Amino acid sequence: AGADEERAETARLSSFIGAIAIGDLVKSTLGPKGMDKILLSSGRDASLMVTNDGATILKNIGVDNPAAKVLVDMSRVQDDEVGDGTTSVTVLAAELLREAESLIAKKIHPQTIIAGWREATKAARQALLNSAVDHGSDEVKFRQDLMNIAGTTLSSKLLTHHKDHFTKLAVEAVLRLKGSGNLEAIHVIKKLGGSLADSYLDEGFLLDKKIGVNQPKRIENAKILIANTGMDEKVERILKHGINCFINRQLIYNYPEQLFGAAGVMAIEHADFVGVERLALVTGGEIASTFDHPELVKLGSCKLIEEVMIGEDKLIHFSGVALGEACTIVLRGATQQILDEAERSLHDALCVLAQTVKDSRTVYGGGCSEMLMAHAVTQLASRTPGKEAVAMESYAKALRMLPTIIADNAGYDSADLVAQLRAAHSEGKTTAGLDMKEGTIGDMSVLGITESFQVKRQVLLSAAEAAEVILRVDNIIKAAPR
Amino acid sequence: AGADEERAETARLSSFIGAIAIGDLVKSTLGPKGMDKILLSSGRDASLMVTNDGATILKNIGVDNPAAKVLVDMSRVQDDEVGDGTTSVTVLAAELLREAESLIAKKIHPQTIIAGWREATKAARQALLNSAVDHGSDEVKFRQDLMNIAGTTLSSKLLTHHKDHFTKLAVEAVLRLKGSGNLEAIHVIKKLGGSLADSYLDEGFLLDKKIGVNQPKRIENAKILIANTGMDTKMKEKVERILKHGINCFINRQLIYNYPEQLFGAAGVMAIEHADFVGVERLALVTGGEIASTFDHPELVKLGSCKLIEEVMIGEDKLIHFSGVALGEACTIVLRGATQQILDEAERSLHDALCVLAQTVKDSRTVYGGGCSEMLMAHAVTQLASRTPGKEAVAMESYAKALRMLPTIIADNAGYDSADLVAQLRAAHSEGKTTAGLDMKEGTIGDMSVLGITESFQVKRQVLLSAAEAAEVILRVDNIIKAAPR
Amino acid sequence: AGADEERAETARLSSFIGAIAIGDLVKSTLGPKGMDKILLSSGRDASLMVTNDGATILKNIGVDNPAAKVLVDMSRVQDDEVGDGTTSVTVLAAELLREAESLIAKKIHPQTIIAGWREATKAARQALLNSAVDHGSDEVKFRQDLMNIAGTTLSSKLLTHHKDHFTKLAVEAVLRLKGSGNLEAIHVIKKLGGSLADSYLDEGFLLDKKIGVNQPKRIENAKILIANTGMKMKEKVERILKHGINCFINRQLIYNYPEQLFGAAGVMAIEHADFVGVERLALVTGGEIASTFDHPELVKLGSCKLIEEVMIGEDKLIHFSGVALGEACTIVLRGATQQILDEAERSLHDALCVLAQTVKDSRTVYGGGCSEMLMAHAVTQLASRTPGKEAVAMESYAKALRMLPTIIADNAGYDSADLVAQLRAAHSEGKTTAGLDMKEGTIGDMSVLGITESFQVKRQVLLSAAEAAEVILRVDNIIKAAPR
Amino acid sequence: AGADEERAETARLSSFIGAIAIGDLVKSTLGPKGMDKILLSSGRDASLMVTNDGATILKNIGVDNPAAKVLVDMSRVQDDEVGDGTTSVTVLAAELLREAESLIAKKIHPQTIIAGWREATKAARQALLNSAVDHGSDEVKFRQDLMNIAGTTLSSKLLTHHKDHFTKLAVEAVLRLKGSGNLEAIHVIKKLGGSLADSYLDEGFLLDKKIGVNQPKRIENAKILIANTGMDTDKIKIFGSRVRVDSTAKVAEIEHAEKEKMKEKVERILKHGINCFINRQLIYNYPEQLFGAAGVMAIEHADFVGVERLALVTGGEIASTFDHPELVKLGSCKLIEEVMIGEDKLIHFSGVALGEACTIVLRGATQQILDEAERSLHDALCVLAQTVKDSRTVYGGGCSEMLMAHAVTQLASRTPGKEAVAMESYAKALRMLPTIIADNAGYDSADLVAQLRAAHSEGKTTAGLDMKEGTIGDMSVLGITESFQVKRQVLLSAAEAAEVILRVDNIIKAAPR
């Protein structure tokens, strides 16, 4: 028991097996016509879970002993930085292991081959520069704002009927974010109500809690009080300040509740901590401790806090923040499996194009980027010294699979597709790519599909470092089914 | 049962297996292209742990009943006097056990063989006075201060692409530090914020704790109180003594009772809960000190320096900085990096840098790095087996071949063919060029001095002694006996 | 499910197996280059500890069923009277068992062979009063007092690198001891401070304790108070001033309040002083009767020369001296400090017994196994001179002596057969000085080395080993009854 | 297969197995070259014990189901009446069972052979008649005081090199003991010093203990105090409770109360002039210091067995609570001192007024074996008391057994009918004893039997088995003789013991499963 040690072929084999198992399930997901899968697990899950998004299912379950979970864990950091849309990074890392069986013939030192990873880093920079990306997306923009990458992220998802409209909306949300402050303060929720738009845009922060039956219905020029310690002196400190609202992250004691109603102060019971922490940045903050917390120790913003009816049910909204560094997003849905999916999509949407204004650079979608890159990577291996080249040239044909997967989900024969694809990219037309609706090659730009430059730079480095940690290191292995 | 005693061949084997298991994992951890590993244990552990530094991982876990942990414990003491660079001493002791197969074929006396260790002492002797090593390091030093051994120590770490810059910084810290004032008060913490120039040197001491959100934002003309005894039990005496002094900050090394805390907020005094003792002792030197007793502590008995105590905001995470110390001889280093627990691999990386420089200025002696020292000693030792008596030569010659593996271990991580590397190396050393050594970036052999990598004189004398007793300790004892548990 | 059935050869087997297992572990230990063994246990045992002395480890534990612990127990009685040097007696008893196989070969009655023990007694006496051993243990003696046998006892042990110097010191200790009063009143400890000398010799009693930093430094015409019961302020002071009390020593925790009082008066107090030292102290100072605070004045007697605290090494020690009786004295040692230091406790104990025997005997034997080869040459002849039955038992004892040279040689690093060839030729010739030289790797002059063995150890061991071998040969029935 | 059902011959076998099992362990114990056996158990037993005396080991343990324990119990009465010598009685009863195999060869009525037990008595009359006994036991006696029976008991033990000298000493010890006193107060301890005599005789009693290193070296006109209770005070069985007082001030009273025990012990003890205090158990630390200044020697953990003999010696005292000093205590006074006996310190109690109780402290040549003196002295005590009372002895070394055996062979042929077979089997039983005595000697058993038998036939009662010789010799020259009582009682006991159970065929069932 305890620690383990590994031997020649068996050590490599443990890493090799992990990559192949995950590649096939993620494979159906890529491209406009991907398909959903449902998984049931060993007693800590409670029921059947279906996730279109590849990253969510891998994070939730550590099924077995082989090295995969650490590789998997990393994809979420990538999601944070950019990696989202359609899952492809995991697939890309996985086929690099197939090359290793070939490598046994390469009887020398496998670690020498490893030098290929920062050669690959050169390849990443070789790829970047060598490929016409884009020149549009100045800021805000009348039509290049979207109806582009979000649509492609959506394309792999069935929802894209009513849903593609939602994706367009996501860009308006980033438009209010641009400036100095970073990517923060975005929260999204869904509701039970049918509408063709299937969404509404809300100016303030969305919360849903109420003090009790009694209390003023609306508060004006509101002051906000946040307490770290539970309620389980208050009137005296309260009256001088002119407090209009109290928010506590936990259980609230019953006695003060009677007081607040007569005073004309609205309090919130068991408010969630995550909303509260964001709020402190928003209202100028407060010093949260024991009941001494009132007056100067705390700063309170004061526009308007009220409970409003959103089409249907009643909700409470915080708005008019002096700081201007934080905002909130509210979506209303018709209700279905794909609407809470918007939770999946908005989180992803935020990272993809907030980034897009910052980059001022994007690349053509639909696999246009991959074939062109494949064309120029082949020359580079030859250009570099030959043993360096052997590792570099293997990398170059790796890019070939992406074109094949995009077409395969479309419904057209893969062999013919690879053939027609290369000739257009080789010629020098960057706009041309894979048109799945056509089944052949077409103009990507007419479609409006473009990918953030960062998704391409970041995927390359993420795959290189993640791939590098495998082949390099022992300590793992797999045994038998279920 | 569980009595635990073994007979003849089997007993030797248990030690032999422990040495081989450890060597394969550690060899890959050596030098510039060295590798870090992840370890997972099912019981009473949270997740897989990854440690590049061999010494920290070996100390942490006592997985097996076979004797290995005892062997492991010995390297920390070495670390205090030096120990580090790249892990190697454990490897050298482990390879010694392989010749034991030869001993069975020897068919005479297992312990007459022990004479080889005596022979080894001569080997320790030869390395020390054979070869001209530094001639420089004439205190403080312009350019030659780093881009040397620290770079080699960091070599085993992936971070080196931007990390080598951090390594260079470490000697600057020793320049202010060095003298005989004391080898203490150097602290390292990493920050999850990124910039091109990773790592900043702070004027004073860096800490990360708060009484709570509660209390005033900053203090003026600060007075410092340190208490050995906890606040836990009284409120009245604490306020009375406090107000007269004007106390701006209270630091207690342990748990702090809640009642006084309300008082500090109203008064306008910032306190620190569960402050670590190591920071506190350093602080006393820094602040002029105090006599830390019971609540009789305030006023004259307490000495407190007063520049500024504040929470700045370095990058992302909030920290508290103590600076402007009147004494002037105790300073701290704050490291910044990309963002990983790997970045934490600074506490165990910095440590590697601090010990090396303090020893280097005073000893006025060093050895050439890159394995230059090892090949030279090896050439000299082969002769020795031939020139000394009867029993001594077989044992001694075997010891000599042990040195051969080190050239192999340094270039093995390179990716180049180890066999080709070993002989090319020997021809240059045999010739008489001490500067020449293994250049991993080159892939062949070159001039170590241009690189500037140098090993401290102390590292060579201790390793030789460490290797000698370490092999002996498992062997020296026969039939360990258990008396049946509680 | 009762008694336990062992017969003829099987009963012999339980004894036979016990001797073979013990001999190999003790075999490493016999000589200058012996090997250290450590045992690790859980429960009442803290951790790894190492004993170089075979006798200490064997009786601390009863590892298994086979009969041998009773045999082991006997060695300790020897240890008190003579004991140490190196542990060799257990090995000789073991040697006897291998010939037991030949006893079945003989095919008649094992009991007749017992006559061999009679023969052994006669053989033992031949090693005695034959040739000359040592002459001139003049008493006091400037050079022959040590740097001899004690060094041999030490050679097996680690401390010998600087300790052989310590060994020289011990004889000075025995010389003051001499008179009519066997061996008594000697107290010794170790110190955490390092020095080349590794030991200082005090003229009185050494005690390590301090009341506190405060309190007057010097006491004269000192009166000493020892109390059974632990440490109200006024009762202690009123009685104290009239007496003139200069010091207080108690074998337990002492109350803080009185401590403050002592400093003003000029009286020094001691907390938790060891009881054993106190019992010795009473004989030394004339003693007293210790009860509650009624204890001062006449019921207590206080001797008065000089009591002072002297900085020793780094640990601050106090000395009691100037005893009118003169009967009891104390020894102080300062070592390297590597837990091996607590080991020095082991080696010193060896020093009081070995040297004291040398003082009374005025006789010794050549060391390095010189005595054993000589006796072996004489004994081979003896077996033939006796008829036949008488012959076989006497000769088996004779060949037993051959292993001792062999055991000395085995730990040396040189094989036993070669050692045997050279060794016998030198002893046979007539040079008693010649013996086993372990550093040499061959044979040499023992006297030049300075290694000698007490005369008593050779005559008692011969009788001792013979009887020890007998205790189980006679008994062919070892019984355990009705489990649990 | 299994049920514990017995049928005809098998029932006989159960009696048979008990006899043979006991005989092999016992047989090696008989005579000069006897063997010691050591017995151990895990609990309700602490260590291996080795008993030379066959009777003592059998009494302590009832190992199994087959009958034999009751037969064993019989030798006890013999031991208190006449005692020991060598244990031979048990073996003789066992060999009676061996003929039984030949009995089924009879193929007839087994109980008419029982008449053999009626032949056993006839054999018994001749034992009285033919043996040659002795004439003389003057009282005290000059030359015939010993060198006789004590030596035969000793002969069985290998100590008979220097020891036969020690046996000779023992009669001097018995002469003072002799008469009215019965058996009490004889104590023996070894000394580690070599001498030809190997023994010394003391007028008083030796006890090995010391108060502590400090205390007066010697006391005279000594007064002795023995206490049933220790000097220790604090629990009382019923604690009186954890206890409640009135804070810390009164608890000072508790510590003070200890002093009162000290005060009573000194004040009362001083008036008497107390020289020596002996306590049978642990002694409280406070009093120990008091005794040293006073001039009084006390003994910590002095064991009780020495004390009871000591009490008879000093006239005794009534041991109770601290009121115990003065008159209720009678302390004889002559000399109590601790004397270096060259080797080890011991305390001598001497000058006892009673005179009845005395101690035989022997020095002798050293080894583990001097502890043998403990083994050997005990044998000496039992034989002399009987030797003085009987004034009759028979020749040892099996001389008695061969003579009787020669006579009985003739008897079988003379008696007609049913009776000779019964008589001859009893008669050949005697033959094994010469064999048992010879076998343990290590000499060949077969050779020994005929040569022995030929010498007896001549008419020499003195002639017997000489084990040291390996052949036959004159027992009388050796000086080995057995007391008259041991031979007449054993004959009656051996026959009767074996006789009942042969008679009964079937040890029956139970209820259970």
When CB atoms are compared, the residue of D50, D63, D292 closest to C3 is D63
Cβ-proximal residues to C342 (8 Å cutoff; 6+ apart), any chain: C190
Beta bridge partners of D471: D466
Task: For residues A158 and A475, give the distance between their C-alpha atoms in angstroms, rounded to a whole number.
Answer: 41
**Longest CA pairwise span in chain B (Å):** 85
Residues of B in contact with A290 (CB under 8 A): 214, 262
Dump strand ranges (E) for B387-464. Answer: 436-438, 445-447, 454-456
Task: For residues A266 and A247, give the distance between their C-alpha atoms in angstroms, rounded to a whole number.
Answer: 9
In b/e form, how buried is each residue of A136-146, taking b as 16+ CB within 10 angstroms?
A: ebeeeeeebbb
In three-state secondary structure terms, A196 is: coil
Which amino acid does the sequence have at A460? L
When CB atoms are compared, the residue of D38, D212, D256 closest to C479 is D38
**Backbone angles phi and psi of D210, in degrees to 5:** -140, 145
Cβ of D258 and C287 within 8 Å? no
Task: Report yes or no on chains C and B touching (3+ CB pairs under 8 A).
Answer: yes
Residue C197 neighbours by CB distance under 10 Å: 11
Whether residue D226 sits in one domain with residue D265: yes
**Backbone angles phi and psi of A205, in degrees to 5:** -85, 135
Cβ of B479 and C28 within 8 Å? no
Nearest Cα to A189, choosing from A32, A419, A346, A391? A346
Cβ of C289 and D285 within 8 Å? no
Give how far B317 is from chain A: nearest CA, Å: 15
Dump strand ranges (E) for D284-420. Answer: 297-299, 335-340, 345-350, 393-395
When CB atoms are compared, the residue of C228, C287, C477 closest to D293 is C287
Cβ of B413 and A115 within 8 Å? no
Residue B315 neighbours by CB distance under 10 Å: 12
Chain centroid to CA B133: how far?
24
- CA Rg value for chain D: 30
Nearest Cα to B41, choosing from A3, A473, A73? A3
Residue A307 neighbours by CB distance under 10 Å: 16
Do the beta carbons of residue A17 and residue A24 sit within 8 Å? Answer: no
Cβ of B483 and C50 within 8 Å? no
Confirm or reject contact between C340 and chain B (CB < 8 A): no
Domain range holding A153? 134-202+325-360
Residue of B nearest to A116 (CA): B415
| Resolution of the entry in angstroms | 10.7
Do the beta carbons of residue C32 and residue C156 sit within 8 Å? Answer: yes
Tokens 């609990």 sit on residue: D43
Q: Write out the two tokens for B390.
A: 């009867």
Give how far D162 is from chain C: nearest CA, Å: 14
Among C273, C305, C326, residue at a domain's last position: C326
Length of chain B (residues): 486
CA distance between the termini of chain C: 10
Question: Sign of the C-alpha dihedral, residues C339, C342, C346, C352?
Answer: positive
Among D306, D330, D355, residue at a domain's last position: D355
Whether residue D170 sits in one domain with residue D306: no
Cβ of A109 and B39 within 8 Å? no
| Helical ranges in B130-216 per DSSP H | 149-153, 160-177
Cβ-proximal residues to B1 (8 Å cutoff; 6+ apart), any chain: none
| Residue contacts between B and C (CB atoms, under 8 Å) | 50
Whole-number Cα distances in Å, B359 to A311, B82, C11, D153: 75, 8, 67, 85
Half-sphere exposure of C121 (CA within 13 A, CB side): 7
Cβ of B415 and A111 within 8 Å? yes
D276-279 vs D297-299, strand pairing mode? parallel
User: What is the side-by-side order of every strand in the sheet holding D276-279?
Assistant: D224-227, D276-279, D297-299
Residue A23 is inside which H or E element, if any?
helix A8-29
| Helical ranges in C115-231 per DSSP H | 115-127, 149-155, 160-177
Q: Write out the two tokens for B177.
A: 């530090």
Whole-number Cα distances in Å, C277 to A323, C186, C200, C351: 80, 10, 19, 20
Was B398 annotated as part of a binding site?
no
Task: For residues A239 and A247, give the distance between their C-alpha atoms in angstroms, rounded to a whole number.
Answer: 17
Tokens 């990983």 sit on residue: B340
Nearest Cα to B153, choosing from B336, B333, B424, B357? B357
Tokens 């016998």 sit on residue: C424
Residues of B in contact with A115 (CB under 8 A): 415
Q: Angle at the Cα of A470 (from A469 to A475), degrees rounded to 5? A: 95
Whole-number Cα distances in Å, B457 to B124, B129, B130, D406: 12, 11, 12, 101
Cβ of B37 and A475 within 8 Å? yes
Whether residue B161 sits in one domain with residue B186: yes
**Longest CA pairwise span in chain A (Å):** 85
Q: Write out the two tokens for B209.
A: 């704790």
Whole-number Cα distances in Å, D469 to B270, D398, D482: 106, 14, 20
Cβ of A289 and B41 within 8 Å? no
C434-436 vs A218-220, strand pairing mode? unpaired
Task: For residues D146 and D157, give the distance between their C-alpha atoms in angstroms, rounded to a whole number.
Answer: 17
Beta bridge partners of D336: D219, D349
Confirm or reject contact between C276 and chain D (CB < 8 A): no
Q: Write out the two tokens for B435.
A: 């500067």
Where chain C is broken, by preceding residue (C–N > 2.5 Å)?
Answer: 231
Give how far A292 is from chain B: nearest CA, Å: 8
Q: Write out the two tokens for C420.
A: 């045997």
Task: For residues D57 and D26, give the distance between their C-alpha atoms in angstroms, rounded to a whole number.
Answer: 10
Half-sphere exposure of D214 (CA within 13 A, CB side): 23
Task: For residues D187 and A83, give the distance between their C-alpha atoms in angstroms, rounded to a whole number.
Answer: 101
Whether residue A432 sits in one domain with residue A283: no
Nearest Cα to D209, choosing from D189, D223, D228? D189
Residue A464 neighbours by CB distance under 10 Å: 21
C364-366 vs C478-479, strand pairing mode? unpaired
Q: Angle at the Cα of C333 (from C332 to C337), degrees rounded to 5? A: 145
Residue A107 neighbours by CB distance under 10 Å: 7
C residues 448..467 contacting D (CB < 8 A): 463-464, 467
Give how far B54 is from chain A: nearest CA, Å: 14
Nearest Cα to B22, choosing from B9, B12, B37, B5? B37
Do the beta carbons of residue C17 and residue C66 sit within 8 Å? Answer: yes
Beta bridge partners of B445: B438
Q: Angle at the Cα of C373 (from C369 to C379), degrees rounded to 5? A: 140
Give how far C126 is from chain B: nearest CA, Å: 36
By the 10 Å C-beta count (0-12 exposed, 13-18 middle, 19+ buried), A26 is classed as buried
Task: For residues A112 and D318, give the distance between their C-alpha atoms in angstroms, rounded to a whole number.
Answer: 101
**Backbone angles phi and psi of D409, in degrees to 5:** -60, -40
Whole-number Cα distances in Å, D277 to C104, C228, D294: 59, 21, 12
Whether residue B129 sits in one domain with residue B3: yes
Residues of C in contact with B4 (CB under 8 A): 40
For residue C218, what is the domain's CATH number? Answer: 3.50.7.10
Task: For residues B348 and D243, give the distance between their C-alpha atoms in angstroms, rounded to a whole number.
Answer: 60
Task: For residues C442 and A292, give the distance between their C-alpha atoms in angstroms, rounded to a whole number.
Answer: 91
Task: For residues C164 and C150, give the distance between their C-alpha atoms in angstroms, rounded to a whole number.
Answer: 8
Do the beta carbons of residue C441 and residue C33 sit within 8 Å? Answer: no
Residue D43 neighbours by CB distance under 10 Å: 9
Technique used: cryo-EM
In three-state secondary structure terms, A105 is: coil
Whether residue D466 sits in one domain with residue D419: yes
Task: For residues A463 and D84, give the distance between their C-alpha atoms in angstroms, rounded to a whole number.
Answer: 100
Task: For residues B383 and B386, give the distance between their C-alpha atoms in angstroms, rounded to a whole number.
Answer: 5
In b/e form, how buried is each residue of B41-51, taking b as 16+ CB within 10 angstroms?
A: beeeeeeebbb
Do the beta carbons of residue B186 and residue B279 sit within 8 Å? Answer: no
Whether residue C75 sits in one domain with residue C12: yes
Dump strand ranges (E) for B8-48. Answer: 37-39
DSSP of D132-177: -------SS-SSTTSSSHHHHHHHTSTTTTTHHHHHHHHHHHHHHH
Tokens 């009525």 sit on residue: D109
Cβ-proximal residues to C374 (8 Å cutoff; 6+ apart), any chain: C127, C130, C131, C427, C432
Among D375, D391, D407, residue at a domain's last position: D391
Dump strand ranges (E) for D294-334. Answer: 297-299
A266-268 vs A245-248, strand pairing mode? parallel
- CA Rg value for chain B: 27
In three-state secondary structure terms, D38 is: strand
Do the beta carbons of residue C457 and residue C89 sit within 8 Å? Answer: no
Cβ-proximal residues to B412 (8 Å cutoff; 6+ apart), any chain: B27, B30, B418
Q: Write out the two tokens for C192.
A: 């955490």
Residues of A in contact with B213 (CB under 8 A): 228, 287-289
Task: For residues B284 and B225, give the distance between their C-alpha atoms in angstroms, rounded to a whole number.
Answer: 10
- CA Rg value for chain C: 28
DSSP D202: B
- Mutate which of D289, D296, D369, D440 to test chain C, going by most C C-beta atoms within 10 A? D289
Was B87 annotated as part of a binding site?
yes
Whether residue B376 sits in one domain with residue B389: yes
Task: For residues C114 and C393, give the distance between their C-alpha atoms in angstroms, rounded to a whole number.
Answer: 7
**Backbone angles phi and psi of C479, in degrees to 5:** -115, 130
Task: For residues B260 and B266, give the distance between their C-alpha atoms in angstroms, rounded to a whole number.
Answer: 10
Which amino acid does the sequence have at D127? A
Nearest Cα to B258, choosing from A289, A247, A273, A286? A289
Whether residue C256 sits in one domain with residue C357: no
When CB atoms are compared, the residue of B4, B478, B485 closest to C43 is B485
For residue A335, what is the domain's CATH number? Answer: 3.30.260.10
Q: Write out the two tokens for B108.
A: 């005479």
Whether residue A51 sits in one domain with residue A121: yes
Tokens 């241009």 sit on residue: B450
Was B155 annotated as part of a binding site?
yes
Which amino acid does the sequence have at B166? F
Whether residue C437 sits in one domain with residue C355: no
Task: For residues B271 and C76, give the distance between their C-alpha atoms in angstroms, rounded to a whole number.
Answer: 65
Count of domains for chain D: 3
For residue C456, what is the domain's CATH number? Answer: 1.10.560.10
Task: For residues D114 and B291, give the distance between their C-alpha atoms in angstroms, rounded to a whole number.
Answer: 106
Cβ-proximal residues to B346 (8 Å cutoff; 6+ apart), any chain: B166, B188, B189, B190, B335, B337
Dump strand ranges (E) for D341-391. Answer: 345-350
Half-sphere exposure of B345 (CA within 13 A, CB side): 26
In three-state secondary structure terms, A136 is: coil
Q: Write out the two tokens for D505.
A: 């065929």
Residue of B nearest to A286 (CA): B213
Whether residue C223 sits in one domain with residue C185: no
Task: For residues B22 and B39, give the distance between their C-alpha atoms in angstroms, rounded to a whole number.
Answer: 13
